[PDB]
A paper describes a structure:
The N-terminal domains of p85α include an SH3 domain, capable of binding to proline-rich sequences, and a BH (breakpoint cluster region homology) domain. The BH domain can bind to and regulate several GTPases including Rab5, Rac1 and Cdc42. In addition, the p85α BH domain, either alone or together with the SH3 domain, can bind to and positively regulate PTEN activity. The p85α BH domain also exhibits Rab5 GAP activity to stimulate Rab5-mediated GTP hydrolysis required to inactivate Rab5-mediated protein trafficking functions.
To determine if the patient-derived p85α BH domain mutations impacted the overall folded structure of the BH domain, several of these BH domain mutants were crystalized and their structures were determined using X-ray crystallography. X-ray diffraction data collection and structure refinement statistics for bovine p85α (105–319) mutants (E137K, E217K, R262T, E297K) are provided in Supplementary Table S1. In contrast, the bladder cancer-associated p85α mutants, E137K and R262T, showed a slightly enhanced Rab5 binding. Several patient-derived mutations within the BH domain of p85α can enhance PTEN binding (e.g. R262T) that may help to stabilize PTEN by blocking its ubiquitination. Further, crystal structure determinations for several of these mutant BH domains indicated that no major structural alterations were present.
Residue numbers in the entry:
A (entry chain B): 113 to 167, 172 to 276, 280 to 297
B (entry chain A): 113 to 166, 172 to 275, 279 to 298
Write the structure that this text describes.
Amino acid sequence: STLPDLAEQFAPPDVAPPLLIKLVEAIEKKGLECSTLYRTQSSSNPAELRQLLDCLDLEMFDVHVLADAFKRYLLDLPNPVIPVAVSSELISLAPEVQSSEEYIQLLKKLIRSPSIPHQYWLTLQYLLKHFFKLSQTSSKNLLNATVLSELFSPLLFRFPSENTEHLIKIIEILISTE
Amino acid sequence: STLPDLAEQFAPPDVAPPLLIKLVEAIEKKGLECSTLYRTQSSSNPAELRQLLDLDLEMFDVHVLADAFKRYLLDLPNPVIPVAVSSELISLAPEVQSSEEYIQLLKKLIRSPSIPHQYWLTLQYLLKHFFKLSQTSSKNLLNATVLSELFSPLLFRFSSENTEHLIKIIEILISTEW
């Protein structure tokens, strides 16, 4: 796992990591209407998927392999798209706060902290934008904000324990409200 | 006070913040042989110097560029050498009072995945600058030890045989650049 930190992969005025842009754009061109996108086990194994990530046009690859590399990317980031500091604070407020808008208000506040490079919030915005376009063809790919939230929240937050359904819900809402 | 974090000012494959490159290159073109470079204060005040940090910097008085260079290091939200690293080096004991070991630890901590690569990259660029200045010591009177004593309080932003060791390793890292 040699994948660099989100903050090391790009900086403003760029809006997202160049490699993540290549994946998203390729995946959207080839799999926007695929009813199994992101819900399959492809043939490749982590070492193979890392080869694709560590070293020419992604449109040449099987869409299900790109989808696995997309997941591999999020798993291999040294720190998750949503830092653990943020996840830890949102998780510990769970019994107290039962307001989705406030959780959303707070997630944005914490991830915009000066102690966290802007690249993380920028990356999350790019990912949410991608998840939203997938949901605009949910009739065909079956990916709605809730299903997209259930697939990718454990990758964005990097959590495997049951005081967590609130985190999944904010991602759902953050996808639907773009 | 509005200066962005080093990790937000650039990313690999760039080697240093673009503004810092403009300062260093301008200062080296106009003041490489100046006998009082970095050891006198110019007329401008912090507010004026900050205006400059937002044209071609070769137009400015060299002593203003030198003060803006210092202003830059002071205004970074986190210093070139993060406090995480400084705190560990300061905590070292009389036993491990080996310069080679202090340097070994600085490299280990500042290359940590929890600290963006931009910080170590920035320090390397500065060391390359300090070394080039010390190669003209016959004319500008700047040796590695004085450069370390002048700039260490700006790099670390933090007095005993521990702080004497931090200044000493910077000295060594300047002289041992090539």
